[PDB]
Amino acid sequence: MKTVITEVIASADSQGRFLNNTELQAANGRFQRATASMEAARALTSNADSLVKGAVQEVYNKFPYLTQPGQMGYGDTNQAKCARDISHYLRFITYSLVAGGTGPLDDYIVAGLREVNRTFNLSPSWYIEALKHIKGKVGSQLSGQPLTEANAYIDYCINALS
Amino acid sequence: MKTVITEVIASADSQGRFLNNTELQAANGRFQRATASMEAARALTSNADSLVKGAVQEVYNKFPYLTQPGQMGYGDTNQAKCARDISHYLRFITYSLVAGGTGPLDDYIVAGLREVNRTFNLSPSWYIEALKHIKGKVGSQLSGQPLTEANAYIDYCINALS
Amino acid sequence: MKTVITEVIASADSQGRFLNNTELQAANGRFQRATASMEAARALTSNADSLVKGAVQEVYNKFPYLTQPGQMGYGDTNQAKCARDISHYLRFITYSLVAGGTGPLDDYIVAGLREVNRTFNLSPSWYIEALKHIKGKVGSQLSGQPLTEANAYIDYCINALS
Amino acid sequence: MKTVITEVIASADSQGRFLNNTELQAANGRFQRATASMEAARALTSNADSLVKGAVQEVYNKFPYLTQPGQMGYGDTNQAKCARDISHYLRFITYSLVAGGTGPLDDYIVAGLREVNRTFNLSPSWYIEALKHIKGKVGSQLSGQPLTEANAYIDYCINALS
Amino acid sequence: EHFNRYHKSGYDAEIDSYIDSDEYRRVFGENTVPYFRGFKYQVGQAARGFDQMQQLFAGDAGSDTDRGIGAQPAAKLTFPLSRPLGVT
Amino acid sequence: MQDAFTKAIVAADLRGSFLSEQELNQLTNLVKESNKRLDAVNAITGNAAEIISDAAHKLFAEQTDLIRPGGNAYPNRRMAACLRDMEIILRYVSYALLAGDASVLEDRCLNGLKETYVALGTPTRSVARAVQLMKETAIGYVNSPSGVTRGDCSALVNEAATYFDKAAASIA
Amino acid sequence: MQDAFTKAIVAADLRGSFLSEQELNQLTNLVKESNKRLDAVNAITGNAAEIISDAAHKLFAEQTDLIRPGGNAYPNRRMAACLRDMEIILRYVSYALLAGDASVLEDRCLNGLKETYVALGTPTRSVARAVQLMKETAIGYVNSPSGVTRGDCSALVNEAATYFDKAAASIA
Amino acid sequence: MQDAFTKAIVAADLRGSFLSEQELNQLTNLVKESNKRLDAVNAITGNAAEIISDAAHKLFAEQTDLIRPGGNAYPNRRMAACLRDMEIILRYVSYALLAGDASVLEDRCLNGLKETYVALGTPTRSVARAVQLMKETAIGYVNSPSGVTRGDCSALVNEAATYFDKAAASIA
Amino acid sequence: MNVLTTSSQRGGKLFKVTMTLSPALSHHPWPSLDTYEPSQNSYSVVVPLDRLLAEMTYIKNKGGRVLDISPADLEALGPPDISSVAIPLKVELWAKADVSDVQAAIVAAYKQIFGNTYVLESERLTSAESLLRNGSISVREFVRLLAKSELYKERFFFCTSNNRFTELNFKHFLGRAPYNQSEIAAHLDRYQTFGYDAEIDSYIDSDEYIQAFGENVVPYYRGFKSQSGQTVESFNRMFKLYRGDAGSDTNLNLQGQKRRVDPKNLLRSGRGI
Numbered sequence A, B, C, D: 001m002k003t004v005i006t007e008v009i010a011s012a013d014s015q016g017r018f019l020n021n022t023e024l025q026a027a028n029g030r031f032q033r034a035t036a037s038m039e040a041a042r043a044l045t046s047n048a049d050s051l052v053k054g055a056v057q058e059v060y061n062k063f064p065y066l067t068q069p070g071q072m073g074y075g076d077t078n079q080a081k082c083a084r085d086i087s088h089y090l091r092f093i094t095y096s097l098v099a100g101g102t103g104p105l106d107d108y109i110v111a112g113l114r115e116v117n118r119t120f121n122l123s124p125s126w127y128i129e130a131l132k133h134i135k136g137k138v139g140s141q142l143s144g145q146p147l148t149e150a151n152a153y154i155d156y157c158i159n160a161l162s
Numbered sequence E: 001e002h003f004n005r006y007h008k009s010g011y012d013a014e015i016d017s018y019i020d021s022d023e024y025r026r027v028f029g030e031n032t033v034p035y036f037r038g039f040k041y042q043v044g045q046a047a048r049g050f051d052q053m054q055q056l057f058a059g060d061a062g063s064d065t066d067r068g069i070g071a072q073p074a075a076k077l078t079f080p081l082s083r084p085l086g087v088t
Numbered sequence F, G, H: 001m002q003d004a005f006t007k008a009i010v011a012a013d014l015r016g017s018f019l020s021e022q023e024l025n026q027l028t029n030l031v032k033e034s035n036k037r038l039d040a041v042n043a044i045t046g047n048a049a050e051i052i053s054d055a056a057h058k059l060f061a062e063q064t065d066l067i068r069p070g071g072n073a074y075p076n077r078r079m080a081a082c083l084r085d086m087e088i089i090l091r092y093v094s095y096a097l098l099a100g101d102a103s104v105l106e107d108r109c110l111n112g113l114k115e116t117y118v119a120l121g122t123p124t125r126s127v128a129r130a131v132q133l134m135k136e137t138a139i140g141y142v143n144s145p146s147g148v149t150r151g152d153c154s155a156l157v158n159e160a161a162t163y164f165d166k167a168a169a170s171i172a
Numbered sequence I: 001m002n003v004l005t006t007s008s009q010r011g012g013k014l015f016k017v018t019m020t021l022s023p024a025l026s027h028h029p030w031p032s033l034d035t036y037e038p039s040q041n042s043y044s045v046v047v048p049l050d051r052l053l054a055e056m057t058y059i060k061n062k063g064g065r066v067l068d069i070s071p072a073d074l075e076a077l078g079p080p081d082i083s084s085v086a087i088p089l090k091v092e093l094w095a096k097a098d099v100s101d102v103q104a105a106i107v108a109a110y111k112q113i114f115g116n117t118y119v120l121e122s123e124r125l126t127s128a129e130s131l132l133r134n135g136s137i138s139v140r141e142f143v144r145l146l147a148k149s150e151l152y153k154e155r156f157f158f159c160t161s162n163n164r165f166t167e168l169n170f171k172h173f174l175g176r177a178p179y180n181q182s183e184i185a186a187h188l189d190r191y192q193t194f195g196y197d198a199e200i201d202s203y204i205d206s207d208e209y210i211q212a213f214g215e216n217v218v219p220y221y222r223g224f225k226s227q228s229g230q231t232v233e234s235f236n237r238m239f240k241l242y243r244g245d246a247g248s249d250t251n252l253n254l255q256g257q258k259r260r261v262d263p264k265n266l267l268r269s270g271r272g273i
């Protein structure tokens, strides 16, 4: 899993060399940031649910036809799934904030994203809206660096999805 | 040349991906530290000379026989060289402080150190004393993080020499 | 470009050996089939247009919302493109029939399909319908082996798209 | 073992793809040809013996000295072997006709041919005559494609031997 | 082919693709250090083998170094590789 | 490798004999079916994507836990693998079907598969299940195509089954 | 590789001297801007996908022929490449922007690029165009972000430009 | 790679058009000749060894010096190469003949061959000569087989020639 | 072979793969027909999870075939600790044993006779236990009853091969592992004519059983310590037959009943038959 700390270790390990000042400087960077990151995670974790409801909802407004019978958005099972999925995205994001790297995101969400989505005919677009809607809400509960961090990670996914 | 900034770029580049939050965190670390680093360099640069004299000198006290005729420490040419050399070590150290990485040290000093030293029968020991003596003096002009940084780099060489 | 003939040459060539009876047998197969293949192509080529109209149309019936303003199906430019695109698919299919291999399809259509489609947000689904609708029409003008051939190639794309 | 069918599988398998129309066309070729091939085999199988006698014989006419004492052609053991060997060649040829590929020939006869022959001082020439004589006889019992097939394989060996 | 591989999957997969390539395995499966197979005819070779290998391989004193000026030199096989056949 | 023809040869070889006339007649008739045989294959390959897609849906509806955190098909990365694998198995099966022989399937594909699954902690049972799910869907197509001359494919259908089953068994 | 700091070092080295106080003050100042610098980069990376997407659309609206049969962006395969390339160039540019030095961009990306394009028959002109289109879009984001402390980024903005332009020039 | 069919396609593609009815009729008739075409190839492959053997004998009878000490075919090792080369060229030619297109031959076999020969110091003229010697022998077989239905092969014969000649020319 | 790292520098579970090498897969750079080094007939590689699929396909597409795959973490684990079996412990059932002592024996017997394998309340045998503790049955005789019991047959003898059942038997009834191919052959022939009961009888009846823990001693593990007339390799075979504490003989596990001792290893100790 890719976090700042793991990477410098890895790099040191490959070369076969002790951790020297170079790497520690980097580490120092992380952990300094953490304070903001951690704050952001506390905020998302708390409002989770509400964010999720709002998102799922949004998607339907954005793509009305999904809720029509014979579509994907239709019938509770699917709605349940839709909820579940977004929860996941969120969950991971928090993780990544705390871990201080994209690592968690990469391994759970991103790797294999395309093919899964292809085989089950999940349209990236949807997810994206979810995220965007989220981003917008988060853009109230947070501020300054905490906010900035939250965004970064949220986006990271947008880009991976698109 | 290995600095924090170059490394994260490199790592990003290998994976083939844009610089994401992971790397920036690291970079940030380098930049915040710089203030201390820079301070240290200003201090060494100024007292350079005095440090050098003191060191060279020390070495002779430590290894009296060097100054006897038919030895290496003997006759001005050699003394001049001895001075020159230590100057270099110092010079590079400053560089490394400023560059925020061992890079400068590795490429100028360390790579090829052994063989040079072997072929000309320069005893690592000597250099080491020089450094140690230096370290001790620096341990007065500096304090707190500035100091800490100075040490790190000075040591890094000790270890490479030994 | 992958056709029967090119492949056997390739395989022969890799091993470093003359074309022996093994390969010619294969070639013979391609040539015998051609008569049917060629027939199919003449049939598609002639009805091209009509097939295209029908398809494009279909897509809109299948996905009404596309024609609404602010969507992709909306505004003539897009419709023009939509037409163009399907034409292409067809064109290539004919090619492949005649060339006696998927080659033409692979190199024009398939390779890079995903990424193009991702970057411009073309939904595979659409294309698919187009094709299916086509397949259904073709299932009248043709019969026996000619038909069979037509299908094979049409499908090949369906699978690549999905 | 190299037959048409095995090869297309192999090629398909390497690229990691399903058997598509390209390969089936090829396969079809093998099967269509079979009818002729099979016919040829029935013909050789039946006249085997007679072909063998004739061949062995021929060789001796062509190279009288072989039958002199102290030579290879001399003394029954050797004659027996000589017979055996040619039988083999024939046997395999039939196999190859039926298998629809050189495969059987390659693996039994051809691979290692040279070294065997070198170490035991079997002169390729001999075998060749055998074959040629055969080819000539076969050129009566067969006709049209059946014939053509028979030749191909017979030759294939001539070339390998030479 | 390789440039695409690198863009999908990065330097590690790029490198792995040469060592795991069938060609590498057949000539020097395991237990054999790689040697210069160029300059002599290799099945499948394609002409241009010999000519391009002479550009990539200087003398035995030459090396592939960057130390002269930091950058590696430019490809030097791009123009070859894309030459038409001379009017027969 | 091997296939129906080559196989018969090899047998004959060890006896040291020309092919028996009886034995030819196996092959002679085998040829006659070719066309049927081909169409069968064509049907699978044509529907491939779908076959899988379908089977998967059903697999996950049954064994909900596979897709739950802590399950074997979670997260995405894993899911992807699971799909990929299914497909492969299918691919091979098809190959066999054309060859007219299990071998190819056994040797390239099935050999070592169980053990892999074991080492990973993949539940072999579920894998097997998937394979069957696939089987049924596949037959579905083989047996109900479009534009094909009407006739009896049973013989082929059963052989298809067997291949699927060898797979199921050796994995399981 | 190289960046602003390392560079200054190297210069100093050949003179054989400690770093001039004047020169330190370049770096000292450079540090102070860091935060700005970072955000700039962050902005690009965050919008990457879009930047490209956008630029492309505009590129193809202008030079219709690229996407017509016989053009260089046709067929799909080629199109894909063209997109890929754009992205890469961008990626590097960003890198440079962080480093505070063109080098990385020059050495990995720009060096030999023209000639490649030439050999392939890719029209260098159009490539250059794309790069600019990108430039403008990118600046767009760098310069108009959200939730960031307001101040002046011009200095950075211009340096960004230059990088884009070095690219445009050497390709062209 | 390329061949007769594929080629026509490609042309059509750049026009952006479905195949002309006229153009189909090229391919339609090309098919009809297949059988002839095949036999031609079969004839070469069947006689390969001989073709070479023969050509060589004649080559060395003419240019005695090649086989004299200090010549290019001396000693054994060199001789071997010379034979090997002949074969290769032949092999390719055949390939082309089947494809119905020079390309394959031009790209893998011919392109850069001259330069190689130059660098080695092997006398290009002699090589060319050999190629012709081969040509004549080969045609010999193509044109005079046994058990083939008698008819006109000229068309194919000439195309064969051309291939050989492209070779001769580009080497020379 | 030993694997030195469990995981790659990039996170990734390494997996040891064992194949039969083929000339194509590796060959000497020598003139003449390609030959793999004889010593590496069975080659082993440790690959990260990512390259595992590619690695295995390539092996199989050549004439290679996969002998087995195993996670590197299970591999590169200590050989089991022999602490508990170095000195078995031993249980004696005195005459006029009080209630507890009889219980201890029973437990111990089930442990050794069945392996770690668990015996459920319903599986347990009241009748046999009944007899012990009002006299009438020897510990030796109880042991016979257990090996006669279906419980025993269902686990050991009805799932695995008779080849496997023999050594399975050896270990339970005698601490020893089997020495030599002959022992395995003798038992197999006994089983074919006499049947299952006679074979079971022949281990308890054997003097080796009598000489150690002859009567009224629960069998203990003689193997893992030096025994008379025991081939040195038998000691190694005991490490294969006995894997750790909390490792059992289980029909239950996937492909449960297999051979711990390869036939070839038995042949080394002795051949003749």
Ligand SMILES: *[C@H](C)[C@H]1/C(=C/c2[nH]c(/C=C3N=C(/C=C4\NC(=O)C(CC)=C4C)C(C)=C\3CCC(=O)O)c(CCC(=O)O)c2C)NC(=O)[C@@H]1C
Residues within 6 Å of the ligand: A059, A066, A072, A073, A074, A078, A079, A081, A082, A083, A085, A088, A108, A109, A116, A120, A122, A126, A127, A130, F057, F060, F067, F073, F074, F075, F076, F079
């Ligand atoms: C929400 C916008 C839409 C929606 C979603 C939806 N998802 C599925 C099925 C799956 N969703 C995922 C996604 C994930 N699973 C994971 O493990 C992860 C990573 C942690 C993600 C992001 C997966 C894998 C599936 C496949 C099967 C499964 O449920 O696990 C469906 C069902 C579609 C089907 O037929 O299989 C749906 C509908 N639901 C909606 O209503 C929105 C349109």
Ligand SMILES: *[C@H](C)[C@H]1/C(=C/c2[nH]c(/C=C3N=C(/C=C4\NC(=O)C(CC)=C4C)C(C)=C\3CCC(=O)O)c(CCC(=O)O)c2C)NC(=O)[C@@H]1C
Residues within 6 Å of the ligand: B059, B066, B072, B073, B074, B078, B079, B081, B082, B083, B085, B088, B108, B109, B116, B120, B122, B126, B127, B130
């Ligand atoms: C000082 C503690 C002792 C001493 C030193 C001394 N050094 C040399 C010669 C060399 N010393 C170096 C060192 C460097 N040159 C470099 O380029 C670098 C990297 C930037 C270093 C660290 C080198 C390379 C030389 C060899 C070439 C040269 O002529 O400088 C000598 C002379 C040895 C000789 O054989 O002439 C000496 C004596 N002198 C003292 O008094 C101390 C014992």
Ligand SMILES: *[C@H](C)[C@H]1/C(=C/c2[nH]c(/C=C3N=C(/C=C4\NC(=O)C(CC)=C4C)C(C)=C\3CCC(=O)O)c(CCC(=O)O)c2C)NC(=O)[C@@H]1C
Residues within 6 Å of the ligand: C059, C066, C072, C073, C074, C078, C079, C081, C082, C083, C085, C088, C089, C108, C109, C116, C120, C122, C126, C127, C130, G057, G060, G067, G073, G074, G075, G076, G079
């Ligand atoms: C039709 C089902 C829908 C539709 C299509 C549509 N396509 C585009 C843009 C492109 N379509 C393609 C496809 C191809 N171009 C090729 O070169 C090939 C291979 C020969 C194919 C299959 C491409 C590449 C483009 C992108 C570049 C271009 O402009 O051609 C659009 C425009 C979308 C955009 O500009 O972002 C549209 C709308 N239109 C409809 O009405 C259907 C929904």
Ligand SMILES: *[C@H](C)[C@H]1/C(=C/c2[nH]c(/C=C3N=C(/C=C4\NC(=O)C(CC)=C4C)C(C)=C\3CCC(=O)O)c(CCC(=O)O)c2C)NC(=O)[C@@H]1C
Residues within 6 Å of the ligand: D059, D066, D072, D073, D074, D078, D079, D081, D082, D083, D085, D088, D089, D108, D109, D116, D120, D122, D126, D127, D130
């Ligand atoms: C017949 C034209 C001449 C002749 C032949 C002859 N052969 C041998 C010995 C061998 N012949 C072969 C050939 C094969 N063995 C195989 O397995 C195969 C593949 C199916 C072939 C083609 C072999 C291998 C041997 C070597 C040893 C053996 O026992 O086979 C001999 C004996 C020579 C010797 O040195 O032992 C002879 C004489 N006999 C004639 O009269 C003709 C001149």
Ligand SMILES: *[C@H](C)[C@H]1/C(=C/c2[nH]c(/C=C3N=C(/C=C4\NC(=O)C(CC)=C4C)C(C)=C\3CCC(=O)O)c(CCC(=O)O)c2C)NC(=O)[C@@H]1C
Residues within 6 Å of the ligand: F066, F072, F073, F078, F079, F081, F082, F083, F085, F086, F088, F089, F108, F109, F110, F112, F113, F116, F120, F122, F123, F126, F127, F130, I049, I050, I052, I053, I056, I057
């Ligand atoms: C899907 C129905 C089930 C599933 C599959 C699954 N597989 C893996 C991982 C691998 N599976 C294989 C498969 C093969 N190895 C071979 O040799 C062949 C035949 C040629 C196949 C088909 C392999 C090699 C792997 C390991 C390497 C890889 O990355 O694929 C996983 C992932 C395991 C992990 O921990 O990452 C999964 C999930 N498992 C399920 O949940 C389904 C029941």
Ligand SMILES: *[C@H](C)[C@H]1/C(=C/c2[nH]c(/C=C3N=C(/C=C4\NC(=O)C(CC)=C4C)C(C)=C\3CCC(=O)O)c(CCC(=O)O)c2C)NC(=O)[C@@H]1C
Residues within 6 Å of the ligand: C033, C144, C145, C148, D021, D024, D025, D028, F032, F033, F034, F035, F036, F038, F039, F040, F042, F142, F143, F144, F145, F148, F149, F150, F151, F152, F153, F156
């Ligand atoms: C069997 C599952 C179903 C079925 C099959 C069936 N097919 C035919 C006949 C033919 N099928 C083909 C198809 C091909 N031949 C080829 O060369 C290729 C590869 C390019 C294919 C795909 C052909 C050519 C024939 C012969 C002509 C024809 O189509 O009639 C039959 C008829 C009997 C026969 O063996 O010829 C049958 C029965 N039909 C069913 O009812 C099943 C659902």
Ligand SMILES: *[C@H](C)[C@H]1/C(=C/c2[nH]c(/C=C3N=C(/C=C4\NC(=O)C(CC)=C4C)C(C)=C\3CCC(=O)O)c(CCC(=O)O)c2C)NC(=O)[C@@H]1C
Residues within 6 Å of the ligand: E003, G066, G071, G072, G073, G074, G078, G079, G081, G082, G083, G085, G086, G088, G089, G108, G109, G110, G113, G116, G120, G122, G123, G126, G127, G130
């Ligand atoms: C898009 C704006 C234009 C375009 C691009 C295009 N590029 C290629 C092919 C390649 N381009 C590169 C690019 C690079 N090589 C490098 O090393 C770097 C820096 C690291 C870059 C950016 C390379 C390697 C290739 C060659 C490999 C390949 O063919 O993929 C093509 C394809 C050319 C072809 O004929 O196939 C294209 C189309 N072309 C346009 O139309 C735009 C103007």
Ligand SMILES: *[C@H](C)[C@H]1/C(=C/c2[nH]c(/C=C3N=C(/C=C4\NC(=O)C(CC)=C4C)C(C)=C\3CCC(=O)O)c(CCC(=O)O)c2C)NC(=O)[C@@H]1C
Residues within 6 Å of the ligand: A033, A144, A145, A148, B024, B025, B028, G032, G033, G035, G036, G038, G039, G040, G042, G142, G143, G144, G145, G148, G149, G150, G151, G152, G153, G156
């Ligand atoms: C410039 C293009 C636009 C802009 C940027 C801007 N940023 C700041 C200040 C900060 N921004 C950051 C951002 C980061 N620091 C980090 O370490 C990281 C990566 C982990 C980021 C992304 C931070 C922490 C600061 C300092 C705290 C703060 O938010 O104030 C400024 C203020 C100037 C200064 O810091 O000296 C500015 C101007 N804002 C604009 O006006 C431009 C559009």
Ligand SMILES: *[C@H](C)[C@H]1/C(=C/c2[nH]c(/C=C3N=C(/C=C4\NC(=O)C(CC)=C4C)C(C)=C\3CCC(=O)O)c(CCC(=O)O)c2C)NC(=O)[C@@H]1C
Residues within 6 Å of the ligand: E039, E040, E041, E045, E046, E047, E048, E049, E050, H066, H072, H073, H078, H079, H081, H082, H083, H085, H086, H088, H089, H108, H109, H110, H113, H116, H120, H122, H123, H126, H127, H130
């Ligand atoms: C024979 C007609 C004439 C002859 C030939 C000859 N060739 C060599 C050496 C080489 N030949 C080649 C040629 C090829 N490389 C390719 O890629 C192809 C096909 C695409 C060919 C045909 C090569 C590469 C070599 C050099 C390496 C090698 O030996 O394999 C020689 C030997 C000369 C030397 O000094 O090596 C000769 C003699 N020369 C004659 O005299 C005949 C007229």
Ligand SMILES: *[C@H](C)[C@H]1/C(=C/c2[nH]c(/C=C3N=C(/C=C4\NC(=O)C(CC)=C4C)C(C)=C\3CCC(=O)O)c(CCC(=O)O)c2C)NC(=O)[C@@H]1C
Residues within 6 Å of the ligand: C024, C025, C028, D033, D144, D145, D148, H032, H033, H035, H036, H038, H039, H040, H042, H142, H143, H144, H145, H148, H149, H150, H151, H152, H153, H156
């Ligand atoms: C031309 C150099 C010579 C010649 C050729 C010729 N051939 C035929 C007819 C056939 N040739 C073949 C051969 C094959 N068909 C295959 O499928 C394969 C690969 C396994 C081969 C080798 C076949 C089957 C035919 C059809 C039946 C037949 O043999 O006649 C003809 C007849 C006319 C035509 O256009 O095909 C001719 C003329 N005849 C010559 O003059 C040269 C001797």
Ligand SMILES: *[C@H](C)[C@H]1/C(=C/c2[nH]c(/C=C3N=C(/C=C4\NC(=O)C(CC)=C4C)C(C)=C\3CCC(=O)O)c(CCC(=O)O)c2C)NC(=O)[C@@H]1C
Residues within 6 Å of the ligand: I023, I034, I035, I036, I037, I038
């Ligand atoms: C000949 C007297 C007997 C015989 C030999 C024989 N060997 C093989 C196959 C192999 N033999 C070896 C031997 C070696 N490989 C080595 O590297 C070394 C020296 C370092 C030896 C001695 C090997 C490894 C093989 C297998 C792989 C390979 O081909 O290299 C065979 C063929 C077996 C097969 O089925 O492939 C034979 C026949 N066997 C006899 O019949 C004679 C009694």
Ligand SMILES: *[C@H](C)[C@H]1/C(=C/c2[nH]c(/C=C3N=C(/C=C4\NC(=O)C(CC)=C4C)C(C)=C\3CCC(=O)O)c(CCC(=O)O)c2C)NC(=O)[C@@H]1C
Residues within 6 Å of the ligand: I116, I117, I118, I245, I246, I247, I248, I250, I252, I253
């Ligand atoms: C419960 C937390 C989980 C679980 C357990 C489980 N275990 C078995 C079977 C056995 N487990 C052991 C355990 C031990 N053997 C020992 O001697 C020790 C330490 C001394 C332990 C802890 C053994 C010996 C067995 C094998 C014998 C037997 O099964 O009778 C099973 C049964 C396996 C089966 O398929 O029958 C289970 C279920 N499994 C779960 O579901 C939990 C996660």
